């Protein structure tokens, strides 16, 4: 019936617990203070974050809660406009790209991206393989660079070549500091707006103009901007007009970037932290991918590299929290009553320790946990969000990441050189800050 | 260019390769070995069969193709007239139809349904509920007695009775008869069969019409098809279904609902006792959905997972097994198979659901979280209910029964595949599994 509470700042309510550099952690450990439910209240706000698979499973209820723009989604809205990840449901424009962008994103789909992305897989296999003795790999970084270039090459046809560069791409260092001023948005600056302004414009010219160069060029590429410019959804009939096909593919980029390079490291990560598992997949990355170049099949025979990637997406997924309200009046978990309107946080993190769930062992990392997702429970692992505001990145995501594990696995002995110890950067995604790696190559052509 | 054709018999063809009691298998054994398409040619008959969703998707373009009456529509047709599903889409009287009976198939519409379908699936988890120890289920007997009922109850407020009787009404009887002499008439002294074919149909007629009769003498109004097709005006023609044509209707629902649902939720029963992890999360959701004696139709639509079980069971063994479309006019399928005017197309839907360019290399597997979001399906990847305006009619009702009948089976029963029992998937126009058998130990839990 009561719902707990964290400690309160009189006014300020909860919010000063999210002024702090790790606030999901924050969150975590509160959730592990309180329990699968705990409200949170901040100025102008109340929403209650859960945290057991219980309780998630109905906050999954399409029927009864929708997807609520947290209030990072809603900064992020201030530059991601109404891309898929920062419309509502009930927004013309987040049905229309969605039907629009479905088809693009499909597992079917990926066959057609598959060659761009192994082209940024080749080259982050390349920066490996040219590094010298006792050099090192920032994985973050690398994985980052990786993820940007794949998105930008895939979504856009456009190439960032982050490979090439210490000082990223322009516009990613405006989008990297728009999400940052978002991020700090929430724990809290008149140079901040003027900042965000010019970073909202940088990125918005740069994407306006490859909209507007591929209109005025005619050229079909396989990237997702052709699929934009000529997609129809099918309800309407209606094309996404080219102010929403830019905050697309920025959404794309927010949205799929650090997400999947948070993955690929904390994949990483663990798989250095874990030996065993380590030599498992890559004795299936050594024994699937037996071309130079991995093709779309291979990846999709990367099966444990798949589990991989979940259990690293469930211990750190990387979009690590998402938000719902109430449809209607409702009751949650038979307990908590819940107006129309009412916001849940959901906690992936959190829900991804759910003991009742996954055992008591539910920190160790065992990719076998997910061999058959028919013995998980529903809404038990939640990293891609739910329901049709799910993911639409998944797919992608998943193959990018089991690709590029995949070739790591293959072309790489890794050496936790550092014993690295797991510090994780919060910013609106999760990622192994400092993580750091060497890689022997196995000397195995390209 | 050239289309594969598995092998022939002479004068007849390929024609024999159907004379088999296991002909939709049969048939995608031969798309096993001869690809997306091939050729089937029987005396007077070509048709090729397609199971790649590239190739289908095709097919599904309405403006290209339109359904056409297979021979055992055709057959069916003798019994089932210019009822929905055995009419041309030009024909008058399918769109009249198909305009009077959209509305009263909606999902909308199974709110009014749903009472008497709980009323039949009440029965038969009492049924169950009362079987001694050691006593086994028959799974597709129950399943087909309890969708035979329910499509009796809903379609025109009629009891067959089914759970009451070993030997079914004789209206069953007659069209389980009549189904079983139009399926083997694709399959081929036949003089007896003619006389018996016509005196079922007889049986159905007088049946039917004399409940149409009845309901319109007594001018009493239910919840059912039957008033709504007495009540029901076609919008566009202004012209309500005439009494022949409601029978019909009354007919195909009965034929086109009946074996494909109890089919569905026999191989989904067989999935789940097949696959306990599914059967578990399944009976969790239906344990914790239906928390009153009487699923509400609220509480069916909540069974998610069951409706993922039900949509795996029918991705793997669709019930109604192909469809059958013509070309409406010259058109290229596929770009390499140019196909004229009327060129018939059978569309082999348990092949198209395990294209593994779609699905996967696990395309044998029942994972029902295939279809936890159903965003993951491409077009016309999954096509149990047949496609676009000529779709199964009945499917928001198939699926609202199945749902509601599993979801229940699964709240009040745990299950025990006792015999280990072995797939045997018999065929007559549809597909069940042909001795399915479990035992059900009651949870206790009272209705
Ligand atoms: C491992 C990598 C990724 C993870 C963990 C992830 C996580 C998520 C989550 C949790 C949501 C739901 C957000 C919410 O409910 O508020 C979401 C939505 C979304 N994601 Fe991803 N994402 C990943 C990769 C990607 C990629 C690569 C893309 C695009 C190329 C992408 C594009 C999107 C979009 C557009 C949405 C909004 C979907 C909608 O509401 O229609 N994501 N993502
Ligand atoms: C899981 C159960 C069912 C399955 C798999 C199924 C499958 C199908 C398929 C594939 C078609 C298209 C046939 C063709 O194109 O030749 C169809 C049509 C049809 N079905 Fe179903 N069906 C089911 C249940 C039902 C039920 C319960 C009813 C009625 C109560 C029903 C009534 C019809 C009718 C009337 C049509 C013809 C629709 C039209 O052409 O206007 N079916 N069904």
Same mark, same amino acid.
């Given at each position: 019936? /009561?719902?707990?509470?964290?400690?309160?700042?009189?006014?300020?309510?909860?919010?000063?617990?999210?002024?702090?550099?790790?606030?999901?952690?924050?969150?975590?450990?509160?959730?592990?203070?309180?329990?699968?439910?705990?409200?949170?209240?901040?100025? %102008?706000?109340?929403?209650?974050?859960?945290?057991?698979?219980?309780?998630?499973?109905?906050?999954?209820?399409?029927?009864?809660?929708?997807? +609520?723009?947290?209030?990072?989604?809603?900064?992020?809205?201030?530059?991601?406009?109404?891309?898929?990840?920062?419309?509502?449901?009930?927004?013309?424009?987040?049905?229309?790209?969605?039907?629009?962008?479905?088809?693009?994103?499909?597992?079917?789909?990926?066959?057609?991206? !598959?060659?761009?992305?192994?082209?940024?897989?080749?080259?982050?296999?390349?920066?490996?393989?040219?590094? +010298?003795?006792?050099?090192?790999?920032?994985?973050?970084?690398?994985?980052?660079?990786?993820?940007?270039?794949?998105?930008?090459?895939?979504?856009?046809?456009?190439?960032?070549?982050?490979?090439?560069?210490?000082?990223?791409?322009?516009? #990613?260092?405006?989008?990297?500091?728009?999400?940052?001023?978002?991020?700090?948005?929430?724990?809290?600056?008149?140079?901040?707006?003027?900042?965000?302004?010019?970073? #909202?414009?940088?990125?918005?010219?740069?994407?306006?103009?490859?909209?507007?160069?591929?209109?005025?060029?005619?050229?079909?590429?396989?990237?997702?901007?052709?699929?934009?410019?000529?997609? &129809?959804?099918?309800?309407?009939?209606?094309?996404?007009?080219?102010? +929403?096909?830019?905050?697309?593919?920025?959404?794309?980029?927010?949205?799929?970037?650090?997400?999947?390079?948070?993955?690929?490291?904390?994949?990483?990560?663990?798989?250095?932290?874990?030996? !065993?598992?380590?030599?498992?997949?890559?004795?299936?990355?050594?024994?699937?991918?037996?071309?130079?170049?991995?093709?779309?099949?291979?990846? &999709?025979?990367?099966?444990?590299?798949?589990?991989?990637? +979940? /259990?690293?997406?469930?211990?750190?997924?990387?979009?690590?929290?998402?938000?719902?309200?109430?449809?209607?009046?409702?009751?949650?978990?038979?307990?908590?009553?819940?107006?129309?309107?009412?916001?849940?946080?959901?906690?992936?993190?959190?829900? !991804?320790?759910?003991?009742?769930?996954?055992?008591?062992?539910?920190?160790?990392?065992?990719?076998?946990?997910?061999?058959?997702?028919?013995?998980?429970?529903?809404?038990?692992? &939640?990293?891609?969000?739910?329901?049709?505001?799910?993911?639409? %990145?998944?797919?992608?995501?998943?193959?990018?990441?089991?690709?590029?594990?995949?070739?790591?696995?293959?072309?790489?002995?890794?050496?936790?050189?550092?014993?690295?110890?797991?510090?994780?950067?919060?910013?609106?995604?999760?990622?192994?800050? %400092?993580?750091?790696?060497?890689?022997?190559?196995?000397?195995?052509?390209?």
């Amino acid at each position: 019936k /009561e719902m707990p509470q964290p400690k309160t700042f009189g006014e300020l309510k909860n919010l000063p617990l999210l002024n702090t550099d790790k606030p999901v952690q924050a969150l975590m450990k509160i959730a592990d203070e309180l329990g699968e439910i705990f409200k949170f209240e901040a100025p %102008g706000r109340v929403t209650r974050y859960l945290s057991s698979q219980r309780l998630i499973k109905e906050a999954c209820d399409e029927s009864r809660f929708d997807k +609520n723009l947290s209030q990072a989604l809603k900064f992020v809205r201030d530059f991601a406009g109404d891309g898929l990840a920062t419309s509502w449901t009930h927004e013309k424009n987040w049905k229309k790209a969605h039907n629009i962008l479905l088809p693009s994103f499909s597992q079917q789909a990926m066959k057609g991206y !598959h060659a761009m992305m192994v082209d940024i897989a080749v080259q982050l296999v390349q920066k490996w393989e040219r590094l +010298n003795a006792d050099e090192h790999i920032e994985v973050p970084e690398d994985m980052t660079r990786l993820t940007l270039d794949t998105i930008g090459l895939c979504g856009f046809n456009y190439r960032f070549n982050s490979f090439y560069r210490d000082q990223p791409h322009p516009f #990613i260092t405006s989008m990297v500091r728009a999400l940052d001023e978002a991020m700090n948005k929430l724990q809290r600056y008149d140079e901040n707006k003027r900042q965000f302004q010019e970073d #909202i414009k940088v990125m918005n010219d740069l994407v306006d103009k490859i909209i507007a160069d591929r209109k005025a060029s005619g050229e079909q590429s396989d990237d997702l901007l052709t699929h934009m410019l000529n997609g &129809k959804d099918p309800e309407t009939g209606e094309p996404l007009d080219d102010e +929403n096909i830019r905050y697309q593919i920025i959404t794309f980029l927010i949205a799929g970037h650090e997400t999947t390079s948070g993955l690929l490291s904390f994949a990483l990560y663990f798989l250095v932290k874990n030996p !065993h598992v380590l030599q498992k997949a890559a004795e299936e990355a050594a024994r699937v991918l037996v071309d130079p170049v991995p093709s779309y099949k291979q990846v &999709k025979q990367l099966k444990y590299v798949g589990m991989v990637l +979940n /259990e690293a997406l469930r211990l750190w997924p990387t979009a690590p929290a998402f938000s719902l309200y109430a449809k209607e009046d409702t009751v949650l978990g038979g307990e908590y009553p819940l107006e129309k309107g009412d916001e849940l946080m959901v906690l992936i993190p959190q829900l !991804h320790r759910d003991k009742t769930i996954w055992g008591d062992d539910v920190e160790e990392f065992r990719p076998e946990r997910f061999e058959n997702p028919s013995a998980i429970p529903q809404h038990a692992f &939640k990293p891609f969000g739910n329901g049709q505001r799910a993911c639409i %990145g998944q797919q992608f995501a998943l193959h990018e990441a089991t690709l590029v594990l995949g070739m790591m696995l293959k072309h790489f002995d890794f050496e936790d050189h550092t014993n690295y110890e797991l510090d994780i950067k919060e910013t609106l995604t999760l990622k192994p800050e %400092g993580f750091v790696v060497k890689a022997k190559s196995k000397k195995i052509p390209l």
